């Protein structure tokens, strides 16, 4: 073989790029392998799994020595076959939290949230001060360490600031807004992470972009918010509506 | 909406997939989900296209046992829903993290019983893509990580986003190995069949390591650890390499 890498787990599988956990045999440190394979013709489909993992690359390598953001540990290619190796960030996914009344656990769970989302404000700063959007945030990419510490997981999304393209990635709760770009399309769905943070997922997925500001009245008469703060998410939902 | 919401399962290409349950009935469901302009590929696709091609898919194929059938699907304003059954069971690439490191010196015991479970499994997914090719369809994705194990060891397939017509002539790649140039219908599926045979006995490092080229070799390292049929493993390699 000659790989100092051990696979140990195969994680999930897409569009012919594959994402694995292994174990660095040389150190016997835990590590992610994300693989891809090179497809070639036909420009309609855009964009190979090598294109986009050399893409997630550069916006990691761009991003090294945040906290939050994986490092990149080794990237080799064995003929036409991409590897990259990453660092295991340890935790929860924050969607796994969705599936799972005392007023005391209702008040620790909103201090809980709170400091969830400013979490990951403060990480998408940082990401922002590097010069990056990163395009994709939202509840599936947010990584819950277990000391409540944050991090985001798939970076392909990302690119640079400067670069205004007006497509801009829909999140799970609400419609993509239309005209933003640089960190506005961050600015937005931050908006939408914090009142996700507290609807059911029954709720999160029925309801529309037009009721935020409902929404928001519904979440502080059951939750023991700042007003303020669910009202201004609710704003920037609406800005252009 | 006559379902709740249990679990989030995944989103990608603006497309949210989740599990629930008719409040009508108890039943348990997958819901996936898609909004208009969400998901935009590179051909014009979105999650909406994308949805409505898997549910045409799901509805050409239904009555064949292992497609998940279509339960319901509608539209609230310009929000597209579609509901399916839940497939009981596990992912095949689940087992390759512990039904299988456990036969590093091994039970000989051991080493037959996932040989006969693998022979088994594979015949499944052999029968249902035969059941699904006399139907019309082409699968295109078929690996370890769309196939189902139930619990009564009969198999089952999730994504059929990748699925097309026999007929639509415009190959993705395998985990395992590279897809082949030029291999059309129903030789896609099994050109796939043939990596998965040597996949199920192949430990992940030598599986992601290995090209195609290797074939013969793997199939002669199975079977020196595997009681594996000769023939069954040297049917795979020649389909695998074929056009080298
Ligand atoms: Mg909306
Ligand atoms: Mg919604
Ligand atoms: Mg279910
Ligand atoms: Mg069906
Ligand atoms: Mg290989
Ligand atoms: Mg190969």
Request: with cysteine.
């Amino acid at each position: 073989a000659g790989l100092p890498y051990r696979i140990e787990a195969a994680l999930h599988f897409s569009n012919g790029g594959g994402v694995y956990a292994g174990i660095d045999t040389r150190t016997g440190a835990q590590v992610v392998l994300k693989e891809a394979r090179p497809h070639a013709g036909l420009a309609a489909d855009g964009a190979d799994a090598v294109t986009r993992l050399r893409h997630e690359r550069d916006m990691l390598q761009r991003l090294a020595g945040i906290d939050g953001v994986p490092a990149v540990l080794d990237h080799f290619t064995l003929g036409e076959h991409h590897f990259l190796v990453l660092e295991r960030i340890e935790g929860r996914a924050l969607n796994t939290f969705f599936a799972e009344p005392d007023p005391g656990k209702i008040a620790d769970y909103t201090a809980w949230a709170l400091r969830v989302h400013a979490g990951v404000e403060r990480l998408i700063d940082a990401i922002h001060a590097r010069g990056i959007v990163y395009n994709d945030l939202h509840m599936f990419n947010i990584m819950v360490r277990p000391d409540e510490t944050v991090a985001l997981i798939d970076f392909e999304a990302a690119a640079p600031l400067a670069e205004r393209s007006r497509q801009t990635l829909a999140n799970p709760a609400f419609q993509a807004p239309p005209g933003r770009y640089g960190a506005d399309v961050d600015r937005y769905s931050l908006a939408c992470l914090r009142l996700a943070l507290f609807l059911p997922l029954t709720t999160l997925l029925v309801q529309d972009r037009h009721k935020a500001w409902e929404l928001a009245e519904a979440i502080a008469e059951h939750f023991p918010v700042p007003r303020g703060f669910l009202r201004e998410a609710a704003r920037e939902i609406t800005r252009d509506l």
